[PDB]
Structures are given as C-alpha cells and as structure tokens.
Ligand binder design. Structure first.
Ligand SMILES: [Mg+2]
Ligand SMILES: [Mg+2]
Lengths: 371, 374
C-alpha cells in the first residue's frame, strides 16, 4: 500500500482501504463509504467512530421502513452493511470505552440478523477449549459430504471478518467452512482468552470438535494467522492444504524488525495490549520476543499456496521466500503468488481486491482437492 | 450538485463523476477499488490524455494476465479478467475523442473482451441486431429458452453502450429471472460510426425493438437512464405494449434541460462535448444544442398511462428533480401507480444514475417491478 485513497494518516487510510474492499463482497458501497468519510477529519478516531456508528443507525432505521414491505433480499443487505459499519467503528474504538463491548455485541446481533434474512445456512458455534468456549461461525450443508476449509485471522479480526475474507466465498465454492476465533482474537480477551504461545492446541481443538464429512481439509491463515496456521500445519497432519497470507515461521523476528501525536495508532496499540492481556503494547511486544517459538518448517509437508502483496513488509516477504525455496527444494507442491500494485491486490491480506484473491485461492484449491 | 454531491478523487467534476461511476461498476463486475485507485494514481487531475493512457495500459496488463492464466484453465478467473479488461477499455473510451483512429479500434477491442468474458462465464448472453430504418442496431440479450419470463428493456442516454446497460441493470434483470434486452438506439454506442445519430423521437426506434422481439409474456417493462429518461418517456407516451416504466431520471422536456445547462481549459468537458457532436452528427456541440433547442418536442406526459418508478438522487441537477416532481404530481392526480424514490446522500446512491450504489438501486427496481408484475 503506498499511495493514498483518502487520508494522510496511514493507519486510517489502510483501514479505509480495507473497509472499501469489504464492500466489494457484502455491505456498503463506495458511495456510502465516501459519504461516511466526508465527516471524518484526518487522523481523528473520534470522528471515525461517530460517523460509522451513525451510519449503522441510519441503516437500522431503513430496515424498519422497508420491513413494512418485507423486501427480504434488501433487509439482509442492509443488516450486513450495518454490521460492517459497526465493525469499522470498532477498529478505532478503545477497549477501555464503555461503548466497546456494547458495540461489539451490537455488531454480532446485526450479523446474525443479516444471516437470518439471507439464504445462507450460517450458524453460530462455540468450540470447547481450555475450560472455555471459543466463538465461531460454521457453514455446513446437511446433505452433502463436502471438503472443509477453516479460516483463521490475525490480530485485527473477528469471526465476522473471516466471513467476507474467505468463508462466504468458500461456501459459494461448495466447501464446508469453519471460522473460529482463537484466544486473543475477537471478543476472547473479554473472557480472559489472550494470545497464547502456540496456536496448535486451539486449532487442533477445532478439529477435535468438528466431525468432518471428508478428510480433505484445508486451512487458511491471514495476517497473524499465517503464523498460527504454520504452527498447526507443522504438527497436525489431518490438515491437507495450507493457504497463508502471509506465511510466518518466526513472529519474534517480525516483531523485532517492526518495532525496532498519532491518536489513531495509539488506539490500535491499546487494543493490542488488551488482546495480549498486558498493560502496554510495549510489554506485549516483549512477551512475543520472549515466548514465541520458531516453526520447524522443514516438518511441513502439505500442499501450500502463499499469497503476498508488493505493499508488504520486507520481512514478511523474506519469510515467504524462505518457505517457498525450502518447500520447492524438498518437492512440496508449493505456489507463491505475488500480488503487484497493478493487480490492485497488493495490500495486506489482499483487502484492496478480495475478489481476485478468492479466484486465486479457489482455482488452486479446486485443483488440489477435487483433482 | 449536477451529477453528485461529494468529491471522491479529482477536482475536475466531470472526471470525478466518471471515476465514481467506474468505481460503481466494480461493485457489480470487474475491477476493484484497489485497481481503480492504482490506475488513478497515474492520472493528472482533469487530464484526459493521462486518463485514456492509464486505463488503456491497464487493459494491456490484464490481457497478459489472462494469457499467463490460460495455461491452467481457470474459467471463472479468466472471465473475471476479461470483464475487468473490457471495462478498463470502456473507461478509457469515455474521454477518447472519436476523431481519434484509436476510438473505434478500442471500441471494438471492448466488444471483443466483453464477449470473451461472457463465453467464459455461465451467463447465456447473446449479441443481437435489431432491424431499423434499413440498418441494424447492436444489442445484447439474455433470454430463457424454456421458461416464459417477463421482459425488461434497458435504455441508456448519451454516454452508454450495450455494454454499460449490462451492469447497469441488465445482468440484474437476469439474476431476477427477467428476459433482458439492451439495445443501443441511434446516437448511442457504435451507431454514429455507421451513420446512425441521435434522432428527434426515440419512439420509432424503441417500437422497432418491440416489433422485433417475440415476447414470451405481455409483461414488458422499460427502464431509461440519463437521456434515456427522455427517450423512454417518448416511447411510453405512445406504445401500449410497455406495461411498466422505470426512469433515472424521467424527462419530458429535454430542450429545457439543455437551455438550462448551457445558457477550453476544461479538456475533459471539451473531449466529452466532441463526443456528443459526433453522436449528433454535427460539426460541433453548439450546432448540436441548437438542433435540440429547435427540434426536440416536449413529451405530452398527460397521456402517459403506465405504472412508473422514478429514481432520483439528492446529488442531481435541480432541473431533473423538478421534471421528476412535475411528472410525479401529474401521475398522482391522475391515479397512476407512480413511485418517486429520492436517494439520500446517506444512502450512498445519490449520484446521477445511482452509480455510487448500483446494488441498492437494483433492490429498489426489482422489488417494485416484481410487485407491479405479480
Ligand atoms: Mg500480479
Ligand atoms: Mg434514501
């Protein structure tokens, strides 16, 4: 990402770019998004939350007018839009704000209302883990034994994000889809479930819990989840394909390199602190450098698709290249798709062109599994 | 507030509206905002040369991508790349002067990419040719071969080809189980290139499509966008085979729209006016305007007897909102089933032709029409 869409504040512009990308799949048009953004001063998180929260209100009011005619199709779309409008506001909401969980629950209710009015068979689930239950969504046809795709996010996602990132598209290509929030993600920190050293357990928990029609099970990790899935894929062999955007074998090194008045960055860092369960982002970083353990990628044997943008930290691209070179040497079926700027998909997690990366992923996955 | 109310990327208002419109197309089909903003990053504000070049080289880029991909036979992806390429070319065409040898060259390249995109998808769209005045009007159709579906005829204005009509409403018509016809009238698409220029009354041309079409049912609706809001008014005022009228926006007095509109350094408007003169078949846009002022006949809207839906943005010229209100009030006193939908700024759909939120506009159109037709 290195020219602006709307804001000079880089964090805000990236978020804005990302919110636009979502609208390509479900929810708000570029029209709504520029309308909302016209009320947002550059680098002002308070304006951001206010405008996005108000748009959600407008949309719920629309739902109430249109109900009076049971325009079913339309009600689902408005509910999705309202949901992702609250999601946008949440991105820059401080966990210490009383509004935070109120709004997080409001987002969740709206997501289910969109699904209630849709012809999508999505259901809420809870995966048992470490005494507690991890929140997730699942979409599974009752009548067909389909191959499964599990979607895992990074440090800025909830199960709702996993939906438009891959899960919905996965379902539309006839896969059973699970999208579960691991500790540290979504609202897990709110119940004492913070980022943990090894994601293998949580991910195996999900598989332990899932009674899979077929054995053809793929896992896809975005952002942070490129590290979490690397971890699962190393040790757990019922995973039959691995998609990572981007794959990470050593987070310690990613942090080390990265972190060697911006009110937007401040709220971001605070949310991270909350997800790690620490008092500082600074302390959180140390926790990582401290405990995060390097994946033994020479132990990965699975068909792999690595997705990486040209607007991507050079350390992320390095680790991607390492894994590519190593898997190729060893004759693992590996593909490294670089997304150039021209492609319009070069931003982290391919948010600036979800549609393209969906085609890439599923053309590849169809080949690996069906074929 | 001529075509929209909020600035997106460019200070030049014509270019900014076109850009908004190109973004909107991507919500339906083809390019992402990511692609569009990358492209735009290489365009100087109000420079239609930069615009044409960036968009043309983006199509070159996508077509190589397609080749690169053929080696693995990804249809869905290939089809998607062709659509993006097609509409990338279409974007460049918008600010291409038709006295350019590359105008028709690129126009045909667009049509080809459109067909290659369709051939790699599951949409059973066909290219058709409607007989009229001893010539043939290019169009597209999507028809069911077994099912007897109601029909939707889509009509554009001064800046559309068959191709635009597809995303604009036609493909949606299809997703909603209507038979769809998208036909370029004289003055539209490639028609001026074969000596078919804007004519005084669009009724004969629309009527020819109806003569040509063999309708599975008698439920036939017509939708007009921009200047098509006038063309379809002329038709609906005379031809009773039309059972429903959607207009964005409805126009009964086009001369007035012109007078009021046009009572240099803007190279964008300038090229676009040149395109108009070409469409009208006159030596320049001024002669063209005079032609309208002295020949365009006011529609006798008091004679219109059809369920009507008018779609108008809060971001639109007050003159078009005015004509829409006049019709609404007339139809309403006369007991016509008429609906006037104003799209607020907040809806994100308040630009001319609802380009900034096509999706919302599609919901509104097909919920209404299903109600009128069931
Ligand atoms: Mg590329
Ligand atoms: Mg509105």
């Amino acid at each position: 990402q290195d020219y602006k869409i709307k804001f000079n504040n880089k964090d805000m512009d990236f978020c804005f770019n990302w919110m636009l990308g979502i609208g390509q799949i479900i929810g708000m048009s570029a029209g709504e998004l520029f309308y909302i953004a016209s009320g947002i001063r550059d680098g002002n998180p308070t304006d951001w939350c206010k405008r996005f929260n108000e748009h959600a209100d407008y949309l719920e009011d629309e739902v109430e007018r249109v109900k009076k005619v049971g325009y079913r199709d339309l009600i689902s779309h408005l509910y999705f839009s309202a949901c992702f409008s609250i999601r946008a506001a949440l991105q820059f909401t401080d966990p210490k704000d009383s509004e935070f969980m109120e709004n997080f629950r409001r987002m969740e209710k709206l997501f289910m209302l969109a699904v209630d009015n849709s012809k999508i068979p999505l259901k809420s689930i809870e995966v048992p883990f470490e005494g507690e239950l991890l929140p997730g969504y699942a979409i599974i046809s009752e009548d067909k034994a389909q191959d499964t795709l599990i979607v895992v996010g990074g440090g800025d996602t909830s199960r709702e994000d996993l939906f438009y990132m891959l899960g919905y598209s996965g379902w539309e290509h006839d896969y059973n889809v699970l999208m579960v929030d691991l500790p540290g993600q979504g609202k897990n920190p709110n119940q004492g479930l913070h980022f943990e050293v090894d994601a293998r357990a949580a991910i195996s928990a999900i598989l332990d819990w899932y009674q899979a029609p077929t054995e053809k099970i793929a896992i896809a990790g975005f952002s942070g989840g490129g590290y979490f899935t690397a971890q699962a894929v190393e040790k757990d062999k019922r995973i039959k394909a691995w998609i990572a955007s981007t794959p990470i074998y050593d987070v310690a090194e990613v942090f080390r390199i990265s972190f060697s008045v911006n009110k937007v960055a401040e709220v971001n860092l605070n949310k991270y602190a909350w997800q790690f369960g620490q008092v500082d982002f600074i302390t959180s970083v140390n926790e990582v450098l401290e405990q995060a353990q390097i994946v033994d990628y020479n132990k990965i044997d699975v068909p792999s698709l690595f997705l990486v943008g040209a607007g991507e930290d050079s350390e992320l691209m390095r680790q991607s290249q390492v894994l590519y070179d190593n898997f190729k040497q060893r004759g693992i079926d590996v593909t490294l798709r670089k997304f150039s700027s021209e492609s319009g998909a070069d931003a982290h997690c391919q948010v600036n062109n979800f549609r393209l990366m969906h085609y890439q992923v599923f053309e590849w996955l169809n080949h690996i599994f069906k074929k």
